Write an enzyme that holds these catalytic residues in place. Sequence first.
Site, PDB file in Angstrom:
ATOM      1  N   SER A 227       0.798  -1.217   0.000  1.00  0.00           N
ATOM      2  CA  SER A 227       0.000   0.000   0.000  1.00  0.00           C
ATOM      3  C   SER A 227       0.838   1.278   0.000  1.00  0.00           C
ATOM      4  CB  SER A 227      -0.952   0.030   1.174  1.00  0.00           C
ATOM      5  OG  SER A 227      -2.079  -0.811   0.928  1.00  0.00           O
TER       6      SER A 227
ATOM      7  N   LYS B 153       3.001   6.415   5.355  1.00  0.00           N
ATOM      8  CA  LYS B 153       2.085   5.464   4.721  1.00  0.00           C
ATOM      9  C   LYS B 153       2.634   4.056   4.884  1.00  0.00           C
ATOM     10  CE  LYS B 153      -1.490   4.016   2.471  1.00  0.00           C
ATOM     11  NZ  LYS B 153      -1.329   2.891   3.399  1.00  0.00           N
ATOM     12  N   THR B 154       1.780   3.132   5.340  1.00  0.00           N
ATOM     13  CA  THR B 154       2.164   1.739   5.572  1.00  0.00           C
ATOM     14  C   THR B 154       1.753   0.864   4.398  1.00  0.00           C
ATOM     15  OG1 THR B 154       0.066   1.276   6.718  1.00  0.00           O
ATOM     16  CG2 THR B 154       1.965   1.969   8.043  1.00  0.00           C
ATOM     17  N   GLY B 155       2.266  -0.367   4.408  1.00  0.00           N
ATOM     18  CA  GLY B 155       1.802  -1.407   3.512  1.00  0.00           C
ATOM     19  C   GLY B 155       2.209  -2.757   4.053  1.00  0.00           C
TER      20      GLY B 155
END
Length: 270
Positions: free
Chosen positions: A50, A214-216
């Site tokens: 993501s 922002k993570t993923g």
Amino acid sequence: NAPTDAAITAASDFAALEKACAGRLGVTLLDTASGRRIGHRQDERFPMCSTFKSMLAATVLSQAERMPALLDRRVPVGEADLLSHAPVTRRHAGKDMTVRDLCRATIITSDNTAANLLFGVVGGPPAVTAFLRASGDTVSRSDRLEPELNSFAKGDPRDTTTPAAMAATLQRVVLGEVLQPASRQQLADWLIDNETGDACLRAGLGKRWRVGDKTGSNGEDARNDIAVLWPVAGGAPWVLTAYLQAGAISYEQRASVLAQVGRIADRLIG
């Protein structure tokens, strides 16, 4: 679990942290004043998962600069668009949402349906890749929609970046002149408001930083977090990108590794 947790906690440099989780860790710590970088496997490819949504939103903002009113355009949310992870858009099935609100949703909750609807607005993964290239990023690439983009295979470059390439792109897009000032500030604000990273880089970073991130992740072994660090006391920002593959440990332990990246980075900034 105890010994792995203890070894993670004891790791004071990135190479030792990688070894503690028997993983493959890619990190770039970037000083935006000097351009200097410290890290580990900075130029190896990792699945974006993501973390790409930061640049999908940037693609939308860039197009909006030449199509004023795009951000106020309303996009239908259909039952057929809905995915397992659709925390915002699920409430709007059968009605519509503004492009701006889809952008927010996909950054701060990682809403997958919102991302796919935005892919439809901008012209798909090829448009995101063209935006990256035009910004000066020759490495990162968007190829597939949600959820298939979260697959990864060694040697398959689809939907991958490197820690150094994504760090440089965050600098150009979130801090530099790729976007107009109002657009870049909107993007920064969405990253600052992210709700999915409390256990990752943020957990290891002290109060002297205002963090946007922002993570993923995927279900196999990937857990990523990319961040911009603004000194609240003023001064030049830093960028910290962290990409982990570590299937031998748990999903929750993968966050603990990213938290430890944060702790190491904070000490290395000093």
